[PDB]
Amino acid sequence: GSSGSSGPTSAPQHLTVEDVTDTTTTLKWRPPDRIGAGGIDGYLVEYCLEGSEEWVPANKEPVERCGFTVKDLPTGARILFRVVGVNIAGRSEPATLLQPVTIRESGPSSG
């Protein structure tokens, strides 16, 4: 027997830095496989400035897509980004980034 799923969906994966701006950054992750009934509400993106121990909410509300854009960031700061899948169950394991972001815009040259 069974009725209504129990527990938060599977943490996010495939979370990497696609692009990086001066005061903005891009993030792209993938949806879980073990969702079942209910469905994931979204994801909570939070960043912690190097030295700080408080993860600030990048997006007040959890996005729907498997990607978001964080704004308002100190150019040249090692900020760590983490994505957590929210749901009626609550939240899931943070897909912390393997590496921090320096935050800076760098385009091509010599064409």
Side-chain angles (χ1 to χ4, degrees), residues 39-95:
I40 187 157
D41 233 325
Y43 277 104
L44 265 177
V45 197
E46 303 150 72
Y47 61 102
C48 179
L49 291 134
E50 222 275 273
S52 174
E53 200 194 313
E54 174 130 34
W55 292 81
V56 179
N59 49 318
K60 242 148 137 224
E61 75 220 56
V63 302
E64 54 160 321
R65 263 266 141 186
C66 69
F68 181 78
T69 274
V70 186
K71 65 197 76 141
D72 210 274
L73 312 163
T75 296
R78 272 109 212 291
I79 300 159
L80 274 166
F81 297 138
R82 63 124 132 156
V83 153
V84 277
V86 285
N87 46 61
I88 192 131
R91 50 150 212 160
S92 53
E93 267 245 292

